[PDB]
Amino acid sequence: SSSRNGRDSAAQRLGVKRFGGQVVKAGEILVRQRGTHFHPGVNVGRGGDDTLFALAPGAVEFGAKRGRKTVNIVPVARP
Amino acid sequence: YRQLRLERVVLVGVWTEGSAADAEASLAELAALAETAGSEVLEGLIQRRDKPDPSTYIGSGKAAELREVVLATGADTVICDGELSPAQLNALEKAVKVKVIDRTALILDIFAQHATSREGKAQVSLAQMEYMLPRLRGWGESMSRQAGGRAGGAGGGVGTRGPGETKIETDRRRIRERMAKLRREIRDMKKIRDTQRGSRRRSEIPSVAIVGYTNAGKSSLLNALTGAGVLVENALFATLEPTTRRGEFEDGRPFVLTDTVGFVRHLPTQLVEAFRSTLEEVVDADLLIHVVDGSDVNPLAQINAVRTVINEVVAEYDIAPPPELLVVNKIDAATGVGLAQLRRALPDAVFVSARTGDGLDKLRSRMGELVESTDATVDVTIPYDRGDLVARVHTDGHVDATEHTDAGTRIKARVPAPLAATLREY
RNA sequence: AGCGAAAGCGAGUCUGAAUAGGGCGUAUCCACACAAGAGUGUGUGGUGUAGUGGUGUGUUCUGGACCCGAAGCGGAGUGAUCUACCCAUGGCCAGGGUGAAGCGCGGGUAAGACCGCGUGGAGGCCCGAACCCACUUAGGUUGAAGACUGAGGGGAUGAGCUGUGGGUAGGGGUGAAAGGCCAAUCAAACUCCGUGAUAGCUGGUUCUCCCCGAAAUGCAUUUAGGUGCAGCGUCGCAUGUUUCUUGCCGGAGGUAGAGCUACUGGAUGGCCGAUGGGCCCCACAGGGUUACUGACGUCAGCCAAACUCCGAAUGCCGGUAAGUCCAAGAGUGCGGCAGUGAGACGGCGGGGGAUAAGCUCCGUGCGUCGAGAGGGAAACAGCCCAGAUCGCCGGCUAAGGCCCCUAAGCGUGUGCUAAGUGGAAAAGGAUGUGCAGUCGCGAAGACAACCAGGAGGUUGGCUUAGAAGCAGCCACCCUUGAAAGAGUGCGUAAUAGCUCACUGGUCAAGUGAUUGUGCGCCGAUAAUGUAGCGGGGCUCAAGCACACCGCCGAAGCCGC
RNA sequence: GAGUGAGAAUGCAGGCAUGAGUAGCGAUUAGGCAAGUGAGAACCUUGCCCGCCGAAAGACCAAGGGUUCCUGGGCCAGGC
RNA sequence: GUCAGGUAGAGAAUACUAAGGCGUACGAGUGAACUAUGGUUAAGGAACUCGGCAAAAUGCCCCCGUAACUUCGGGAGAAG
RNA sequence: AAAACACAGGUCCGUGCGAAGUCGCAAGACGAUGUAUACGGACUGACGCCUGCCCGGUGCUGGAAGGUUAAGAGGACCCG
RNA sequence: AAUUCCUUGUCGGGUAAGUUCCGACCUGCACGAAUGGCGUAACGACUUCUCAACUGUCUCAACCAUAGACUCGGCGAAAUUGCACUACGAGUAAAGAUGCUCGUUACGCGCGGCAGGACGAAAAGACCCCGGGACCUUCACUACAACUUGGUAUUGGUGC
RNA sequence: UUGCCUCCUAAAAUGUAACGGAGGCGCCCAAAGGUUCCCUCAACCUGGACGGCAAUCAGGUGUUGAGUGUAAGUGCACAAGGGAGCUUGACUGCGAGACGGACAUGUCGAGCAGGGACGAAAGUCGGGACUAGUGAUCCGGCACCUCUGAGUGGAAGGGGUGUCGCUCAACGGAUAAAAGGUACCCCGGGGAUAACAGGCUGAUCUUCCCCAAGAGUCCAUAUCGACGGGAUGGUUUGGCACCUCGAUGUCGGCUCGUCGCAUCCUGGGGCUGGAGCAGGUCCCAAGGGUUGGGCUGUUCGCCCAUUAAAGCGGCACGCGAGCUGGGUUUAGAACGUCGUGAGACAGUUCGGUCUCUAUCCGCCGCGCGCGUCAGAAGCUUGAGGAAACCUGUCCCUAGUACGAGAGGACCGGGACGGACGAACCUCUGGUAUACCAGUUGUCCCACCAGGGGCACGGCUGGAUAGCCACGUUCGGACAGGAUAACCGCUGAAAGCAUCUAAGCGGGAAACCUCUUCCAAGACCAGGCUUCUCACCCUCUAGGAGGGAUAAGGCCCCCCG
């Protein structure tokens, strides 16, 4: 005579971390996810845990390839 | 009341009276009752026991095998073919770990689910409240895990703690008050029931009460004879309240046909005191029509059970209904070849199918002699100008044909005593 | 002068194969250059390095550690003068009853046994004083008494009561055993000592002014009333708009919503409808009628926190522009110092609950109280207005009010209210009025009323006691079209009466049903006393809806 | 430099209030009268009546207390 | 712990009294309610009540008579 | 204040004598100046009819053929 | 049944009435033979009922005397106290108001009484819970006493 | 249940609780990893020997619905999905940047070197498509070291690198090692937190109501009203824990009541399946009453007798500063059951201190002072209250109406009663503490007789008064007015009808009088009468302060 439930897991802090039009350093964890909900575009790599991390400086932008949403890092072009 | 999941049931009994045939008949009767209540009979067994065990009602080895068979069949409901005690059922349940009830529990459940009117619904509700009354302390779940349910402390002077009576005593008091109020209510509605038929038995008219164990008439005979269609069924205990109609002979005198609810053998002695409708109706009835099935394994069993119940109520109420004629219906079903066996010792065995049938001409012609005992038997000669000499001589009940004469007419028929006592003149 | 564990080295060192990546120092800075700009490094030349000793302050360590407060632990001792038991030696038990053994006589029986006959005065014997207890009851119950008295009560030759003097002493005694008593206390006495024990617990903590000003959240906890850290407060040091608001721009969401032929599930009815059963020829050959069942399909119409083909508003991250910019007394980093870590209610979205609780758990750059006065609320923390530096015999205002209390209006106009609704309330019913449309008739006097109209084969029907216009029944294509139907409902069981679907002459507008427009009725109904406007009173509104005019209204703003 | 600030800890010691001029004045015996001492007398003294105990409320001891026993003086304290 | 009178009494109980000792230490009134203690009570006699709690009733001596049961003792002072 | 305790009567267990048990670190003492018809401990509680079965578990008694098991004799090999 | 929850088990007695009581049947939740089973004469300030008398226990209470109380004179406390020229109803409030709002009522001061309230006085709730204790139990842990086994010094000597 | 992982809950960033909803993990893979390459399933038709519909092969139709080791989610058809070849990166030293973040943890990482693997030759690989599969610290095991080595040399031991030892699962892991009882209880706290009551909600409960399927001999509504729905009261079981634990004494009984009507009777009405009598429903009606006992503590309930009834409920389940303590609810004891046992029963049985001098309000009476406009007295009205209000039997009406009959009236009167209350003591009866008498014991009055003190007034039989009930007398009304329910008349709105809209009426134990009492502190302080109605001194005349005074009252005194 009780409840069989009542326990869950500490919610891992998923969700995009850096948003469009945002300067990002090399290696910054762009987005933390589980499935490839954001395919790696250019200058961005997919880590072990299906997360997105920059490869080169610049600003983050969100784009779409054939039937997939991905992230890109456009350069800065310093004066 | 509360209804739970059914259709997975087992049956346990003890054969301590009758023979193996009677034990099997009781098992079959219980199986049919459970079926009607909405259960699927899986396994029903009887133990040859002189008297039920005072612990589990079956015994240690019997309980072991019941646990085995029920675990193999995946059922969770046990039904005892009797009236078990809280002590019996506590062990009978601790040995199986599944719900347990008895035939009286089954009958109260089916009565509760078939109840049509608030009257019978309250009667059945009172029956089940009074059956569950003993299980306040007997309700181990109510009186378990109860450490500190009350103030277990004392002292000299200020105590401030007000369970001045044991919590169980307060429960007993409250349930007793509820039951007393319900009993007062069921006694009060006696007057309502009375005034409902108050008009009846004021204008005295023959009343024929159709009696029979459950599944005997089910109002089918009423629908066939009177012609009024009421709730008729092949299931058990379908007619939950009586009903009267006008059916009679060619004579204008009505023969009020009093419906009766079924009487199952081995009653739980809780409705025979609450459901007074049919009992009062048979008490006040003038003639009795005893219904019997001609294809049953032992019609005499039901016959004598009904006779015993009738005699008990008769001695209880200080009455005497001499007219008692039986009728062995359900012969058109052709499911019994003991027709000769019944007829060789039981006259008036007219045949009507379980739900339909005809052939009641002989029935009516034999029944009339026991109710057509009027005292009118007066003839008269009405003069030339009849005028208003039609009121109760022709526009009445038991009025018969007669000859004709020039000087009005010689009415050789019968005129009722109270209606026309001396108004006529020879 | 630091690096590692160290040897050891040294502005380098450790890790290190690594002249390569990192950790730690070369106080800090200025200028120069070289690669790079992947977040800067490398070097060169100058400034060059600030610690320590008193001292106050604020904290913290060990000491009693801001103060008071236990139950209890242990060491040393004092108690058997009360009480428990025992030991030695004394004393006491009025009075009256019962008759055991024992002893001798006789009857007795071979003899015994027994029966009596008299003496005998015992017995944890009987009644009952002293005495010892305390069973009932009344008192007492700040008493006369920290345990008693008045009445009764038990034992009263014994396991009796009692004096005198001794013994048993605390984890011990003693105990006819009740966890009883051991000096008014005993589930481990008493006094001193450790000792100022300890308390996550309760209480208390004393003069003032100024400035700033919380939280009742998250995490962890032998933890849940505590505590560490975090956030929140405060002071100093540095950054100085980096905070915050708004606009614009770039962003991901999957909530509200919405959809199901876009997936997964539930399910409202129809269309063909094999697939199986019936009968089918009972042949399993062989032909399908099939209320059965008919998948998958299809027509229309739905539903879902763990369904989403879709999908907002807010919120959020960033870029940019401004705004506040004599200040929000912003944000950020490091320290000094805490409290906080019981929240509550109100709005919203929710969970639990019965979508009840002044209920409980949640999110809410949401509010208030908490920690907050003032006015409105009848009083009333969580409601509304509004954040009190102080004084003023000034004014304007917010919420709310403007008949009296009670300051301001029994305000001005257009309508409703009949219920004191106002000044509690539901399912439901309903010829109230206020007001929108609408019906065939229809200012032909419409319609009502006065009206001639009283069984057509009209006693048929199913039937014959009559079916007697007429208990009731399935139909009224029925008219010199007059205003009557095998005359139905008021009535007659039978007649008999007269309405009803319906009328000419009198000739004088309504007649049904919707929106029910807003207001109404009831429904409505607890116990101390009007008690469901604060009351008086209010419709001659002081009630309701809408317009307009004003005034009062606080510690708000303004004036000095 | 402080033993530096009380209004509270059922705080401590002293003095006082209200309850209050209230309860109570300590049983199941009971006092009264005349006279006197005295200034002042219900309670003292004397006389005379009544009542109470009388296996005692009498008489004598033990332990216990220790000068209370008696004579002569006093009525501030104590005798409710 | 020792004395223990006189009457009725069996009696050291009980009543009054001898000698002896006391009226013992707040009093005077006052028919209030109500409380304690007693007393008395028509008619019924436990109907109150948890319960005959309390209160009430028998009680002493002498004659008769004395049950089931019984360990043969008793019950038993039965009862009447 | 009792149904509880105790009680006489029973059963069992231990004790062979500075016995067992108990007080006591020990000495010594009670037990007992007693000696199994005694003492101590446990339960039952006069008297009549009787105490049925079971040694599986835990206790108590006693065991041989075996297994486990600390201290000491032991002095192989290794290492310093 | 001092044991029975169901339960006031069912039948027969007791009364007019019997959840208590007695005799039986026995379906013994959850009797049981030395934690003794069943009786038992006598006995019990034990418990339960029944009967005769008895009565103010009662129908239903009444009256009388004392200690009281009360008046007077004397002496003269205490528990309690935040305050005070301390009403009631309807409410509202930490949800039960003498103290707050609206109304109703009420001359000032005492005496005697009744006890509804002032969540009245007394005891920092014995109850429940939190923390600390304490004592007790055991097949809780860890220790020790006591008892018990062996080695070892006291402990030595001739044979196999 | 305690840690970790997944979704929802969870309110479209992150995060977010509940003893909320569904589940998984304390692994498995030496291939299920790395790399190179290749291919696309689920379902359907055409063919069967099985091979079923369906085991295989062909043609296709089929575009993600299959499958992804493990729960679910996110992703994967470009493949992470299936097949095959080689290989061991399931590496070493590192690792800028970071995410998450109280702290401790956890997670990803471009890229450099060594030596590799796979590939043609770029390129990929520091385990598993991701997210769980694990546990810190301390103390020790094992192997290596190019560390140290208590004077030296060593060695032991220590250090380091790698790694091992915990269902420390209470999973931030207080010990390496730990279970229970307390009703013998104690202490510090809590209304942070319960039992009783109060408070909130009304699930449950009580009283209804809403359309009515059917019952009711035909007929849904005379009476029931199913299925479903809407509420009232907060008296039950309840839910929350809001005040109270530095005490709110808890059931029943007794005393005392006060109140609501949701009326048991009594009183007025409608319908009835109301012939009469009998009755049954619903409206109004709270003035009065509403019995005595056996059982059990019992509230309740059952039973015996009655009557009209023996109503339901609140007021801390009213009332314990009013009482008893029956059992509840301490300490004793026993029975059955559980626990090895301490002990427990939420079972039964026996026994188990019920404190308090009334201060304030409150209530019943009692007074004193003052006031009611000179000071008094007498008699009263009555603003306002208070008390009471019950009813049964019988005779006549009348065996009349009614009813064929059985049976049997309404309205009226008349008599007698039960309870309650007031008054009184004439009768009956009780009591009588100074009455009279009889008498026991004792002592005294010298003594006999006759008397007295004491013994409950000694006891006993009487006992006037006073007080009282058991006794006696009286009250419950008749009558008026306005009404509730209900019953009608005139009557339009709406030429009619209609109890209503204006009116008229009948209408009850309810209401106001009628009855009794109090009552002008009735602050509106009342009305009609009577009594003396007159004088002096002081401040310096302005009002006051004294004096004796009139009627009258009081004090004291005799008293009831």
Coordinates of all heavy atoms in Angstrom, one line a residue, chain C residues 28 49 213 226 229 280 531:
Chain C
rU28 P 54.9 40.3 -11.5 OP1 53.8 39.3 -11.9 OP2 56.1 40.4 -12.3 O5' 54.2 41.8 -11.4 C5' 52.9 41.9 -11.0 C4' 52.5 43.4 -10.8 O4' 53.6 44.0 -10.1 C3' 52.5 44.2 -12.1 O3' 51.2 44.1 -12.7 C2' 52.8 45.6 -11.6 O2' 51.6 46.2 -11.0 C1' 53.8 45.3 -10.5 N1 55.2 45.5 -10.9 C2 55.7 46.8 -11.0 O2 55.0 47.7 -10.8 N3 57.0 46.9 -11.4 C4 57.8 45.8 -11.7 O4 59.0 46.1 -12.1 C5 57.2 44.5 -11.6 C6 56.0 44.4 -11.2
rU49 P 61.9 49.0 -4.9 OP1 61.9 50.2 -4.0 OP2 63.2 48.2 -5.2 O5' 60.9 47.9 -4.3 C5' 59.5 48.2 -4.3 C4' 58.7 47.0 -4.8 O4' 59.4 46.3 -5.9 C3' 58.4 45.9 -3.8 O3' 57.1 45.3 -4.0 C2' 59.5 44.9 -4.0 O2' 59.2 43.6 -3.6 C1' 59.7 45.0 -5.5 N1 61.0 44.6 -6.0 C2 61.2 43.4 -6.5 O2 60.3 42.5 -6.5 N3 62.5 43.1 -6.9 C4 63.6 43.9 -6.9 O4 64.6 43.5 -7.3 C5 63.3 45.2 -6.4 C6 62.1 45.5 -5.9
rG213 P 18.4 50.6 1.4 OP1 18.1 50.5 0.0 OP2 17.7 51.5 2.3 O5' 18.3 49.2 2.0 C5' 19.1 48.1 1.4 C4' 19.0 46.9 2.3 O4' 19.7 47.1 3.6 C3' 17.6 46.4 2.7 O3' 17.0 45.6 1.7 C2' 17.9 45.7 4.0 O2' 18.3 44.3 3.8 C1' 19.0 46.5 4.6 N9 18.5 47.5 5.5 C8 18.6 48.9 5.3 N7 18.1 49.6 6.2 C5 17.7 48.7 7.2 C6 17.1 48.9 8.4 O6 16.7 49.9 8.9 N1 16.8 47.7 9.0 C2 17.1 46.4 8.5 N2 16.8 45.4 9.3 N3 17.7 46.2 7.4 C4 17.9 47.4 6.7
rG226 P 16.3 25.1 12.8 OP1 15.9 26.5 13.1 OP2 16.0 24.7 11.4 O5' 17.8 24.9 13.1 C5' 18.2 24.8 14.5 C4' 19.5 24.0 14.6 O4' 19.2 22.6 14.2 C3' 20.6 24.3 13.7 O3' 21.3 25.4 14.2 C2' 21.4 23.1 13.6 O2' 22.2 22.9 14.7 C1' 20.3 22.0 13.6 N9 19.8 21.6 12.2 C8 18.7 22.0 11.6 N7 18.5 21.5 10.4 C5 19.7 20.8 10.2 C6 20.1 20.0 9.1 O6 19.5 19.8 8.1 N1 21.3 19.4 9.3 C2 22.1 19.6 10.5 N2 23.2 18.9 10.5 N3 21.7 20.3 11.5 C4 20.5 20.8 11.3
rC229 P 30.1 28.6 5.9 OP1 31.4 29.3 5.9 OP2 28.9 29.3 6.5 O5' 29.8 28.2 4.4 C5' 30.9 27.7 3.6 C4' 30.4 27.3 2.2 O4' 29.5 26.2 2.4 C3' 29.6 28.3 1.5 O3' 30.4 29.3 0.9 C2' 28.9 27.4 0.5 O2' 29.7 27.0 -0.6 C1' 28.5 26.2 1.3 N1 27.2 26.3 1.9 C2 26.1 25.9 1.2 O2 26.2 25.4 0.1 N3 24.8 26.0 1.7 C4 24.7 26.5 2.9 N4 23.5 26.6 3.4 C5 25.8 27.0 3.7 C6 27.0 26.9 3.2
rC280 P -28.9 -28.1 -45.3 OP1 -29.9 -28.5 -46.3 OP2 -28.8 -28.8 -44.0 O5' -27.5 -28.0 -46.0 C5' -27.3 -27.8 -47.4 C4' -27.2 -26.3 -47.6 O4' -26.1 -25.7 -46.8 C3' -26.8 -25.9 -49.0 O3' -28.0 -25.8 -49.9 C2' -26.2 -24.5 -48.8 O2' -27.1 -23.5 -48.7 C1' -25.5 -24.7 -47.5 N1 -24.0 -25.1 -47.7 C2 -23.1 -24.1 -47.9 O2 -23.5 -22.9 -48.0 N3 -21.8 -24.4 -48.1 C4 -21.4 -25.7 -48.0 N4 -20.1 -26.0 -48.2 C5 -22.4 -26.8 -47.8 C6 -23.7 -26.4 -47.6
rA531 P -32.9 38.9 11.0 OP1 -33.8 39.4 9.9 OP2 -33.4 37.7 11.8 O5' -31.5 38.6 10.3 C5' -30.6 37.7 11.0 C4' -29.2 38.1 10.8 O4' -28.9 39.2 11.7 C3' -28.2 37.0 11.2 O3' -27.0 37.1 10.3 C2' -27.7 37.4 12.6 O2' -26.4 37.0 12.9 C1' -27.8 39.0 12.5 N9 -28.0 39.6 13.8 C8 -28.6 39.1 14.9 N7 -28.6 40.0 15.9 C5 -28.0 41.1 15.4 C6 -27.7 42.3 16.0 N6 -28.0 42.6 17.3 N1 -27.1 43.2 15.3 C2 -26.7 42.9 14.0 N3 -27.0 41.8 13.3 C4 -27.6 40.9 14.1

